[PDB]
Design a binder for this molecule. Structure first.
Ligand SMILES: O=C(CP(=O)(O)O)O[C@@H]1[C@@H](OP(=O)(O)O)[C@H](OP(=O)(O)O)[C@H](OCc2ccccc2)[C@H](OP(=O)(O)O)[C@H]1OP(=O)(O)O
Ligand SMILES: Nc1ncnc2c1ncn2[C@@H]1O[C@H](COP(=O)(O)OP(=O)(O)NP(=O)(O)O)[C@@H](O)[C@H]1O
Ligand SMILES: [Mg+2]
Ligand SMILES: [Mg+2]
Ligand SMILES: [Mg+2]
Length: 325
């Protein structure tokens, strides 16, 4: 029989252009059949009624019942490409940074301000006009303030008096804009946050996309922190700049992929002061508008499936060569 690769995610993701491009390519593997789980089934059917698969590609996004996906994996024991339990931890910036630190991965100096919503003023925060002190640790402006929820994209940057003060409020893109300047110079007074040192880059973020620990595609985009106007090409797509990762960065990708147990994993790098710092790990993410990435990603994923399962299915398989970017 065929090896069944099940895809379990919200319809917005399962029916996205990059997903469809990759799945049509995985389907070219002679012994692989792809089954995409319907959103109505994921949401409303018990896991006992979900389709069977031998290999499961499943990931959380807004509205996704991660508890059910975990229960399905426990019930059916498929080969899991992106670990499901780690997807709880990827939703919490505190957990993400804790893992990065434990892997010896360079990241911005940071401190966690945990605030009790019942007693918001009893937390260990002291504020001056050009700095904050978080659990005693001093952050001179410029510094960055991130909600502890990794799903909350309201990241603020606070400017020093020497630069005019105020703040840059970032958010999920709304059309032409990804951030806006605010004259507010004082930090947020409700919620829990990570405070971290601002890393000076050339004005771009490096976005890294892994497919297993030995393949990573990278590209750069204008930092939303800069002025907040999104750069677009004549075709209306956001401008992307070419990147080739250095040896240090290829190792970072290897580490992130394995540490979070996410075969397919996106993360952000800040190239600053002659090193590269991880500031965000997003989990499952595909590159868009690259035919070569679609070819590479599908081949790698198919090869992973075959390597793991071909012996069980008595299918002859010789491990092929694979790209690194
Ligand atoms: O960024 C994420 C989290 P993830 O990246 O885990 O999905 O979700 C966004 C929504 O942002 P919040 O996390 O709620 O702050 C966003 O809500 P707003 O409309 O309030 O900004 C918004 O959520 C709309 C929404 C989806 C599902 C149920 C209810 C609402 C957005 O969806 P879309 O606008 O890109 O379709 C979600 O991204 P997704 O594509 O689902 O990953
Ligand atoms: N410590 C830092 N120093 C300088 N710039 C930073 C720092 N942290 C974040 N940024 C910038 O702010 C942007 C958003 O921060 P990030 O931690 O990626 O938030 P996010 O809400 O998880 N974004 P997403 O990639 O959509 O999940 C980054 O892409 C950088 O341009
Ligand atoms: Mg096939
Ligand atoms: Mg990011
Ligand atoms: Mg993120």
């Amino acid at each position: 029989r065929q090896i069944v690769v099940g895809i379990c995610s919200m319809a917005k993701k399962s029916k996205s252009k990059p997903m469809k491009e990759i799945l049509e390519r995985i389907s070219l593997f002679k012994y692989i059949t792809v089954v995409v789980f319907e959103e109505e089934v994921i949401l409303n059917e018990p896991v006992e009624n979900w389709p069977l698969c031998d290999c499961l590609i499943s990931f959380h996004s807004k509205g996704f019942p991660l508890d059910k996906a975990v229960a399905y994996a426990k019930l059916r024991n498929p080969f899991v490409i992106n670990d499901l339990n780690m997807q709880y931890l990827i939703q919490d910036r505190r957990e993400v940074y804790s893992i990065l630190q434990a892997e010896g991965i360079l990241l911005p100096r940071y401190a966690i301000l945990n605030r009790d919503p019942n007693n918001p003023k009893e937390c260990n925060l002291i504020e001056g006009e050009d700095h904050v002190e978080v659990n005693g640790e001093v952050f001179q402006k410029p510094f960055v303030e991130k909600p502890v929820s990794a799903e909350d994209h309201n990241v603020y940057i606070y400017y020093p008096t020497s630069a005019g003060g105020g703040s840059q409020r970032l958010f999920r893109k709304i059309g032409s804009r990804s951030s806006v300047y605010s004259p507010e110079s004082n930090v947020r007074k409700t919620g829990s946050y990570i405070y971290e040192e601002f890393m000076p880059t050339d004005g771009t973020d490096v976005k890294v996309y892994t497919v297993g620990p030995d393949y990573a595609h990278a590209e750069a985009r204008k930092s939303p922190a800069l002025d907040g106007k999104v750069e677009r090409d004549s075709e209306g797509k956001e401008v992307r700049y070419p990147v080739i990762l250095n040896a240090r960065e290829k190792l970072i990708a290897w580490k992130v992929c394995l540490a979070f147990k996410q075969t397919v994993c996106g993360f952000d790098l800040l190239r600053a002061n002659g090193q590269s710092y991880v500031c965000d790990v997003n989990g499952f993410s595909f590159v868009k508008n690259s035919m070569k990435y679609y070819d590479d990603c599908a081949k790698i994923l198919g090869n992973i499936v075959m390597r793991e399962l071909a012996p069980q299915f008595h299918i002859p398989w010789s491990i092929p060569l694979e790209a690194e970017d």
